[PDB]
Each structure stands twice: as C-alpha cells, then as structure tokens.
Enzyme design. Structure first.
Site, PDB file in Angstrom:
ATOM      1  N   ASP A   1       0.864  -1.181   0.000  1.00  0.00           N
ATOM      2  CA  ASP A   1       0.000   0.000   0.000  1.00  0.00           C
ATOM      3  C   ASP A   1       0.909   1.242   0.000  1.00  0.00           C
ATOM      4  O   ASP A   1       1.649   1.468   0.967  1.00  0.00           O
ATOM      5  CB  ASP A   1      -0.883   0.007   1.255  1.00  0.00           C
ATOM      6  CG  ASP A   1      -1.937   1.107   1.225  1.00  0.00           C
ATOM      7  OD1 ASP A   1      -1.688   2.175   0.628  1.00  0.00           O
ATOM      8  OD2 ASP A   1      -3.015   0.915   1.811  1.00  0.00           O
TER       9      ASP A   1
ATOM     10  N   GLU B   1      -2.506  -0.171  -4.386  1.00  0.00           N
ATOM     11  CA  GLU B   1      -2.462  -1.416  -3.614  1.00  0.00           C
ATOM     12  C   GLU B   1      -2.311  -2.652  -4.471  1.00  0.00           C
ATOM     13  O   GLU B   1      -2.885  -2.744  -5.545  1.00  0.00           O
ATOM     14  CB  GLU B   1      -3.738  -1.598  -2.800  1.00  0.00           C
ATOM     15  CG  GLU B   1      -4.033  -0.529  -1.788  1.00  0.00           C
ATOM     16  CD  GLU B   1      -5.404  -0.724  -1.167  1.00  0.00           C
ATOM     17  OE1 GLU B   1      -6.385  -0.819  -1.926  1.00  0.00           O
ATOM     18  OE2 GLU B   1      -5.507  -0.785   0.070  1.00  0.00           O
TER      19      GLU B   1
END
Ligand SMILES: Nc1ncnc2c1ncn2[C@H]1C[C@H](O)[C@@H](COP(=O)(O)OP(=O)(O)OP(=O)(O)O)O1
Ligand SMILES: [Ca+2]
Ligand SMILES: [Ca+2]
Ligand SMILES: [Mg+2]
Length: 341
Positions: free
Chosen positions: A7, A106
């Site tokens: 992330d 992500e």
DNA sequence: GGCTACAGGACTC
DNA sequence: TCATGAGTCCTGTAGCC
C-alpha cells in the site's frame, strides 16, 4: 498461504513531493476542485504533515484552508499518479506471478511459492520496499499474513513507510481483540449496527445467532465476518478486470432543465468514451446526484455494444426518466458504462 | 424456490 | 457557499420458468 500486501504511502501527495522535492516537510493537500465557486470541492488526500492537523481525504477544501491557510494546495493530477502507479506495479510483478492490483496504490502478492516462512517473507518485504524506493523514491507500507484481509490490516497498523507481519498466533489475538470497526469492509453504518448488537470484536460474531446478525448486516457481510472470526477466511489473489468506466461532473448550478443539463451529460459521455479505449459497453447508466446529495440512476442493457451516438441519444432518455420520476434538482450528472464485450 | 435485471446501499481508494 | 470523483460488491423487488 502467505500473502504480501503493498500500500503506497499518502500516494497523490507523495508523488507531488517526488516531482517537486521542495515540498517535503510542508503540509501538502491534493484537491479535487468542482468548479462551482472559489475553492469549491473536496480533498483527495494530504501528506502526513497536513493530516496531523485534521486535513484528510473527503473534507471540503474550504475547511482544510481554515485549518491550514498556508499549506500547499495542489489540484489533483490523476493521470500522473496513474503513470507512476503503473510503473510501481510492474516492479511488484517481478516478485510473483500471482499478484492482484486492488487499486491505484495497492497490490496483493501470493508469495506462497517464493518464500518458506514469515521470516523469509518479511525479508522479501524489505527487498520490495527498497526496490521501489531505489527505482521510484516512493515509500510504501507492507503487510504480511495468512490471507488478504489480515495482510491489509497488518499494513493499516504499520503505515506510513512500514512493514508488519501478522502470524497465526497474532491472528488469533486480533480476532479476540481487534476493534471490528477496523476490519476491512466495515464502515460507520455497519460498525454502528454491530455496536448495537454488543458486537465489538470479530470473535463476538460467533456467539450471536446467525439469523439475527444476518437480518442486521445482510447475509454476505455476516458470513464474511464469521469466516474471519473462525479463522477460516479464504479469498484468492486474482487478476482484476475493470467492470465499468464512467464520468460524473458537477454543474455550475443546480437544475432540472433538460437543455441546461445536456452539455454536462454529453461532456461526461465524451470523456467516458475516451476512457473506454477499445472496450465496447453493452450497458449504460445515467447517474445524478440531487441537490440534497442523494444518488439516483437509470440504466439500460442492450443486446449489442453501444456506439457513442447511441450513448448520446439513450443517455437523454434515461435522464428524462430521472426527471419524470424525481422532482428534486440535479447537482451532479454523469454516466457509467458496463458489461463490456 | 431461485435466476435475472434494475435501482439503491455501503465501502474503499 | 461544505458536500470530489471512480469503481466494486451486495440486496430488495418483480418477472419468469
Ligand atoms: N475520498 C477520496 N476522494 C478522492 N480520492 C481519494 C479518496 N480516498 C482516497 N483517494 C485517493 C487519494 C490517495 O492518494 C489514494 C490512495 O488512498 P489511500 O491509501 O486510502 O490514501 P493515501 O495513499 O494518501 O494513504 P495512506 O494513509 O495509506 O498513506 O487514492
Ligand atoms: Ca495508500
Ligand atoms: Ca472501518
Ligand atoms: Mg489501502
């Protein structure tokens, strides 16, 4: 199974910093200007300097300015962040064939066949964090665990610029102790419903009668939470294929006058078709947000692909349906295409 | 009973 | 004169086999 989740940290803001180093250290706020008036719009994201003070994604730009009048306010440059994102994603592919790009910032990687344990996984994580930093000077946070949900939770706990592993024992502790509100997929509305049932932890969903939990949050979310509580959650890392493309814009002023709304709708269609790029949709939905901020929509599926010309004519009929069925004034108008050929 | 399309609800980035 | 914009999955309702 060992899942490694990546992330990117305060993404849109961090990219701007990479492009203009003089920004590092100051509070940066990436804005989505709507165009109604001076500073109308909302915050897409802001770096951590700005977040320490309450300026974060979602708040009105005008409020952010009240809090940090001297922060740097930048108009969102999506295309730029996307190109940067695409390059980072290609860096991650070198670490696993089984990779799922969940969004602009992500990715989930199934490194079950690459590492033998969490120690090796953790080390692989560092290697990934360094690679991305060397190649793009972008810091990201890594989450590692037995499945997608807990690898994500792991990252949520370690950001920014972190790396965390949630082993089997810790998974058992979290089911017992983790605030269920921090479980991916549980937003305020659901969290509230769960708090009202005395449900504050994952483990609690085990003692409540299923029918009651189901009747409250729906069959899917109930099974989801329960599967996690039993530590029996399994979701595969799969390549995601985009299912819909759309564009919705804010009008200078509210209205329910077909001719006044038309130009916005058409602009949204033009931009959408540009985005479609070779994909031919069989379904079209016109989406309108009313003055009171409610979302209403009307759509149609055709037995064949929709040409731009058909999109124009059909979108009007659909907007008309909205107008004829809802009396409120429209604030934002747009379109969304799906069911690609 | 349950599949299908459509519209609204909720969530995440 | 708070209130962006993009995309995904689930559910209630009504038609239909
Ligand atoms: N509500 C929103 N409106 C517009 N853009 C948004 C919104 N939420 C998130 N984004 C964008 C901004 C972010 O740079 C990007 C990724 O989201 P997210 O990870 O949750 O924020 P962030 O990258 O700034 O993360 P972090 O807290 O992880 O450091 O997508
Ligand atoms: Ca992020
Ligand atoms: Ca939450
Ligand atoms: Mg995230």
């Amino acid at each position: 199974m060992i899942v490694l989740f990546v992330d990117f940290d305060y993404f849109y803001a961090q990219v701007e910093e990479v492009l203009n180093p003089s920004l590092k250290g100051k509070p940066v706020v990436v804005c989505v200007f709507s165009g109604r008036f001076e500073d109308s719009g909302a915050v897409a994201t802001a770096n951590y300097e700005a977040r320490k003070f309450g300026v974060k994604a979602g708040i009105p730009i005008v409020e952010a300015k009240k809090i940090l009048p001297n922060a740097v306010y930048l108009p969102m440059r999506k295309e730029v962040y996307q190109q940067v994102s695409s390059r980072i994603m290609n860096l991650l592919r070198e670490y696993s064939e089984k990779i799922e790009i969940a969004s602009i910032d992500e990715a989930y990687l199934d490194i079950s066949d690459k590492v033998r344990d969490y120690r090796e996984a953790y080390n692989l994580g560092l290697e990934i964090k360094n690679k991305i930093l060397e190649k793009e000077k972008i810091t990201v946070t890594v989450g590692i665990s037995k499945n997608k949900v807990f690898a994500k939770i792991a990252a949520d706990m370690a950001k920014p610029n972190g790396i965390k592993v949630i082993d089997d024992e810790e998974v058992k502790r979290l089911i017992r102790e983790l605030d269920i509100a921090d479980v991916p997929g549980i937003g305020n509305i659901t969290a509230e419903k769960l708090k009202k049932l005395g449900i504050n932890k994952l483990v609690d969903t085990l003692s409540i009668e299923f029918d009651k939990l189901k009747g409250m949050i729906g069959e899917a979310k109930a099974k989801y939470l329960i599967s996690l509580a039993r530590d029996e959650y399994n979701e595969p890392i799969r390549t995601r294929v985009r299912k819909s493309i759309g564009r919705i814009v804010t009008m200078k002023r509210n209205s329910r006058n077909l001719e006044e709304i038309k130009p916005y709708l058409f602009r949204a269609i033009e931009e959408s078709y540009y985005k479609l790029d070779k994909r031919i949709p069989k379904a079209i939905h016109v989406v309108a947000v009313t003055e009171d901020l409610d979302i209403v929509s009307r759509g149609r599926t055709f037995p064949h692909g929709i040409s731009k010309e058909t999109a124009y004519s059909e979108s009007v009929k659909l907007l008309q349906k909205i107008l004829e069925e809802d009396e409120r004034k429209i604030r934002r108008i747009g379109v969304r295409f799906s069911k690609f050929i």
